[PDB]
Amino acid sequence: VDFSQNRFPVLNTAENFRYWKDRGLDRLLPRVFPLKLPAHRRVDPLLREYIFFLHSMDPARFSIRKLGERYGLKERTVELICREFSVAEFLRRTELATPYTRRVSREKAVLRMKEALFSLKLGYDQLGDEDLDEQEEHEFRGFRSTQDWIQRQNIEVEMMSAFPLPAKRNPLPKRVDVDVTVHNTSKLKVMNWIDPNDKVVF
Amino acid sequence: ERFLFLDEERSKRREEREEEQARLEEELVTLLQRQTKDRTSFDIWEFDGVGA
């Protein structure tokens, strides 16, 4: 079972960092991985209609946050569900287009096919499975996640001591310009250009 | 809400009130499933959107 010179049986190791990821000639095997689908397209359409009804009826009592809390979804997912259902209902009731005549992009057509096959195989979910407020979990999320961009280093070289070491110089947040609208009407939009470095503010 | 303490003198139970509510709801549902302008009167009726 291989050898380790030190005892640290955890999942946070270079060996276990990206677990199951090929590290030899098997990197050239054409493996098939599960396809990703949106939650607002995974949940059942009847659940979508129910959420849309609740929100379009009482957006205060049936808030986006409350709907997501009850049905195990995210606020963005609930918003997308409501927008899509409202668009579809508007089109259907105004008799502008059927669900199979609205011109869409190739990507959205492929997404529709993906969800159709997902429902035919596994069936639509009857409840949401997302999390309302994602957690601070150590996971690989692309090459950008594997390094300290500010320090420009992937490895923290440090000495061994039993006593405190000098603290690291902390970064200072970048002071970038922003535009903040201050007065908008049907004719004119006025926004204040802010320079966060200007010392005399008045 | 309209009546409240005006007609709540008779109401003196909880389970019986729930049963009466159920009976009223059933009656109203059956009625639904069957098939002047004086603001101070009960004869004001606005049939907006009511038709075939």
């Binding site: 030190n6 640290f8 009857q126 490895i155 923290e156 070289v157 | -």
Partner: protein, 107 residues
Amino acid sequence: RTLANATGQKYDLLVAPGEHWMHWPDRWFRPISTEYARMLERIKKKRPPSYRRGFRAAIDEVIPEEIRPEFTPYTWKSPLQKWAEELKRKRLTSHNVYETEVFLHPP
């Protein structure tokens, strides 16, 4: 590993800190018999248990057991959540799972 062994210092990958130098001492995991446990409890001097550092320490030797707490009904669970969880547990524990049928409409 080569650099750290040669130098005696820490060369830590940020996605895996302590991977190469962290070693939990074997003095932590030294099992003891019952008689020697009694003798050690007698010889040692007790220390008050600190809640902050002492909490979450009620564990012992474990044996595998299958659980499924994703479908355990509770009072706070909503009716729709209960319905969905019940259907999911029936599907998962069904005897027809692991049945691969290439044809949707079988002969």
